[PDB]
Amino acid sequence: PQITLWKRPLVTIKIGGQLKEALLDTGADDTVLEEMNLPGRWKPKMIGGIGGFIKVRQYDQILIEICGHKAIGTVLVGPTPVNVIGRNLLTQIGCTLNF
Amino acid sequence: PQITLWKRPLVTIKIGGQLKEALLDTGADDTVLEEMNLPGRWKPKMIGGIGGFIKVRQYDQILIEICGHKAIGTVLVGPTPVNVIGRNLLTQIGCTLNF
């Protein structure tokens, strides 16, 4: 679909079997979700944002459905202000910017 | 144009008579640029993301040219680690997400 930007581009995602709401974020290299329980191994990682760095749990090769489009990739879980879908998954569902 | 997301969506902007590089960032409500002496009055503001908040100066009705497309709106100036073009200006140049 074509998504305009007058409102936040929030979409429904399915991850770990649970539905969540997330922001399509072209300024994010990586996908970062708020604290949740996810099945699978994870490793400690750090990521930097506008205000500095935070600690996250890095889950690899996670299945995630974004508006019905399937992606399988890295998901970071930690104290982000909002769930963000980053370019690592936006590229998998074929997302481009157009103007 | 059409911008894929394999790499950071960086573009050249013209603001305050100067050329800069900035991200087209659908996850940013507002436009945030590196420290630069814009003339005119401004208001203090705090904006938050991953890692916490930074202090910025809010300038209103600022002209920016983005890859040949002109836009006018609020620009926040401060010690941001990267320049982001946010939705307040992306809507003006007719930018959409497409997948």
Ligand SMILES: CCOP(=O)(COc1ccc(C[C@H](NC(=O)O[C@H]2CO[C@H]3OCC[C@H]32)[C@H](O)CN(CC(C)C)S(=O)(=O)c2ccc3ncsc3c2)cc1)OCC
């Ligand atoms: C020099 C490198 O420094 P650096 O490595 C990190 O630099 C950066 C810093 C910020 C960005 C853009 C942001 N991306 C992001 O956080 O992505 C992270 C996840 O993926 C990784 O890739 C990029 C970083 C990692 C988002 O697109 C937009 N944010 C909001 C969302 C909801 C979080 S916003 O910026 O907080 C923002 C903007 C306008 C606004 N108006 C009212 S609120 C408000 C908040 C890109 C690179 O370390 C720090 C020293």
